[PDB]
Amino acid sequence: KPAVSVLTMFRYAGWLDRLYMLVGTLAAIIHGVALPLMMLIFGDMTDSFASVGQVSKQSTQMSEADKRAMFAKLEEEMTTYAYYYTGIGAGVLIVAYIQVSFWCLAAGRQIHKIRQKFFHAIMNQEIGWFDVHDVGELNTRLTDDVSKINEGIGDKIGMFFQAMATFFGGFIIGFTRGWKLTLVILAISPVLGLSAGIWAKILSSFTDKELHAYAKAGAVAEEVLAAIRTVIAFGGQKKELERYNNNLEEAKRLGIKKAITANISMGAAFLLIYASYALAFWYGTSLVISKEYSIGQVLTVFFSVLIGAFSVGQASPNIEAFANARGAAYEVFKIIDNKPSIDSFSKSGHKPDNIQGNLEFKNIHFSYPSRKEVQILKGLNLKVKSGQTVALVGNSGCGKSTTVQLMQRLYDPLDGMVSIDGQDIRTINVRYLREIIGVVSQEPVLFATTIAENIRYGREDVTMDEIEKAVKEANAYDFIMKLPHQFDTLVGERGAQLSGGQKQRIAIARALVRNPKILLLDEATSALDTESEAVVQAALDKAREGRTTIVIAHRLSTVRNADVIAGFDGGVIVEQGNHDELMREKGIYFKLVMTQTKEALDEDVPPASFWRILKLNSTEWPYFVVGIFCAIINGGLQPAFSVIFSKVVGVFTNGGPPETQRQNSNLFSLLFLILGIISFITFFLQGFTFGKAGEILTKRLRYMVFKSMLRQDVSWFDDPKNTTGALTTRLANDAAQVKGATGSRLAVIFQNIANLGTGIIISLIYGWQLTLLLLAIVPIIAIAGVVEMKMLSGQALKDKKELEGSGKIATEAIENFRTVVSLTREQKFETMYAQSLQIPYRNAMKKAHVFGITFSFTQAMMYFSYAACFRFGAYLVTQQLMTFENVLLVFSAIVFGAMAVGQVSSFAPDYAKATVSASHIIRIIEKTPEIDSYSTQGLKPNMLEGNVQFSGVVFNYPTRPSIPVLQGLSLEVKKGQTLALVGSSGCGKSTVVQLLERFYDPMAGSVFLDGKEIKQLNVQWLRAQLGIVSQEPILFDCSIAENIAYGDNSRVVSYEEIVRAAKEANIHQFIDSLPDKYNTRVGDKGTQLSGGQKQRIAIARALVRQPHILLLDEATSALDTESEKVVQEALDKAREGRTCIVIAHRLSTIQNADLIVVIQNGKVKEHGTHQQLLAQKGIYFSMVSVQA
């Protein structure tokens, strides 16, 4: 993974930028050391109560002389301590504000220049750059990687400096207040980073082991869902459900262990930090009895050091974000500092005023940049006279268009030069070159705007009248005037789709507006019907007037009208001259003449479900029974801590017998380690309870889910929201993550309710007014912590949604770069981009201010809470209300308990994502279809007749109830006789075949099989005797024997049936010939096969079940040569003794059908045999008159 040097990355910072960064950092530093200072002052705070405990404990000394020496003293000390606390907080809001605000600000101002110059840089690149690069990922880079470099030069490093300042502040205050104790805790430190480092490796080892564990089930997942039509059709749903399941109980069982080890990692962590508490206090409290360190000093150094330690942990992601931001900056700066071979942005060449129009190509050697290994043009020589129209032909290779591509100077020749007049094409400016060179591509292209605007892109300073005149010059003024909104009619990608002819003509106009003296036409008529081709070529011929025109077309019809015809054989131009010369010399030209004669949309729709998801995991009560109790223990573990902590310093603040200062000390210290042991117990237990639970739940769930998917109708997979990828992804992620809402959430809610629950009881007994103040302050800060992540993500989305206005412009400007570059106007697109950017950049100032005041609002009262609680608490302890130890206890319980619930909320997966990803699962499983293939109901007679009779039956697709497909068409087919379907196109060609297979339910009307209605029969048994062959047959990545045997399920197929079904489909010859026999895998993972052979296998497939009904629907549209003959020959011998329904567009193998049905609109307007309908001179006579 690459990265830019740090200095190079802030290259686009300036005066004010460097200023903002420096001031910001300076604020970050002082914000950082604020917390350790708060710790020192905390120690200096406890050291004062320590003196008022011991005196008032032992016996009695002075009743009237204590209120003056103690009560009046502590008020006088807390009146200054309050100033210290509140002071530091009041400063903190300011310094935090400057920090976040300024960093965010400067960052934004840099990014703004970065994205723009990135866009400009992409545009500056020549097409040779676009050839070797993927425009798809480049387009995404402009949004994702610039956003990625935005994060990591802003708030993140502000919080990095703050974090490091908290580190050094903590260690400095530590060493300044305490020498020994700091070295103690730091001596404990290297066993934590050694532990967090090995346990991270263990969890990451099984994590990458899961990816390629379940992938063996995802393979048979995507394979099924992709081939689903043939699956339901061949009813292999059972064998496929099983085949899927057999790869589940080997991939998540691997995950059980990982869940376990993860929990053990967390447990070990708590064990070791609790151990550090035990040891640290065991040393410090024994250090205060020898009256070396005070009690408050122990706290000062312990807190400051621990805080400075965790500061790095909270500095780690902030420096990681800076890191990978440099990695992104590498790609972007690369493009910006890159000046291409052709610029193409500033004039450096001449601008001829003649301007003539004489073309010349002298000794052109050129090969494409993508493949330097294959040379294209070798000594290309070709001159073109003024106004003379020259055509290119020969069917050599890309060379043709390459010449055209060389002409607008897209590429530059390897050897030789392309000269216009007496000057080379490189000795002239490139902008001006392409302004005087028009071009019409093989595929037209229009930008999402108005026709008028699409024209403007050819020339900006054109009046409406000029636009009109130009439109007329392209024979486009007719249909455009017919458009509803005239010239303001929308076009392009989204809105008002046009025909290829119209779209192309508009482009002819666009080019014509430039008034070029040279006109290039690369397959302009190509990919167009014979009717539009007339008008298009008509405009073109009138556009070749007064202009020097080179033209390449696949159709030699419009070629003979040129002045010079040039032929291409290999890399050189061999035959050149008039039409008659090339006809007379019988060249390549003559030979050709004779040879040619959804992510958001998904998550939005489901409502629900409040805690019903748990009912899914409910199948295993015990794991949860142990889990909940364990969770309550691990939860009550935290309140215990804050109690025992308050008891450590309590015995050194409330005095008492000095002889009992040690006896107590060592008790509590050791007890902490005890509190550690049980903490490693709970997590070891939890990882066996919930950990297993959600995993079993996962496996099981997927099974159910997958089964559910196979139950659905075919109408559900046609639904635009359910694709094989989205379904397999739904299966791979949301099915696993459901566990989040089951065990883990119970664990969290119980650890929380135990912690804050029991903890609030304790703090309520040890304090009335103080606890009531704390249960007031803490929730208020907690609400702020929510609002913090509300206005953060909230205005994070608002910024992106106003950034799509740019994203569109960029995207359109990139995917059609090769187009715009020929119309120049790249700078016009840049200007559009900036005009789109000017609005969210203006909202970056207010943005920074907002992040500022929000962050500072949260951060400010985080110290004011200390100030309030300790002031009020001091007010308590000083007066008759007791005591200090109780103040510290209440504080610790409620506050650090409240932080504890934060950590517990952060552990488990996100409940929101869990629930929404669960709802899809519960809806998918509980989804009852119209057509059920699992039902064990149905007739199943003894009659092997098979008569198909559609009566009435009007149908329309559920996906799109617009222009119904079947308007109640009717027909009938008897046994043996085969039907034929003829029409303009599909619908309802395929629809009928699909209805017999029962893929849909017609709104009104019925379809009868034999004497019974279809809906009365068994769904599966109906498809048990229905054979089906689509246009593009698919096989399974298993094997051939299984593929053939896949036709008939719920039975042992064996060698006999397969060889018998192979020999009659005429595929047996191809099997022994290619090593080895039947064991081969198809396809893509094994030996590839041509469509012919694969389809033959697909026939031998449908033939195994001995179907009395074959459904043939546009079987072979892509089969050529003598491969289509043997296929249909193999078909003909299996069409006897079976009812068949054939659909073809060939119209040459329908002449021998028994019945031929001409379906038009939504009904049958012609029926009978071939010659019968032929003598009818209806629509069948006009449809068969195109066979010449």
Ligand SMILES: CC(C)[C@H]1NC(=O)c2c[se]c(n2)[C@@H](C(C)C)NC(=O)c2c[se]c(n2)[C@@H](C(C)C)NC(=O)c2c[se]c1n2
């Ligand atoms: C250190 C920071 C990560 C962070 N710790 C936690 O957010 C946390 C989440 Se569970 C937990 N801590 C447990 C647990 C670690 C045993 N410890 C306590 O409940 C506890 C009772 Se007294 C006390 N801490 C003192 C300390 C210094 C004795 N801590 C602080 O003044 C302090 C200010 Se921020 C912060 N700590």
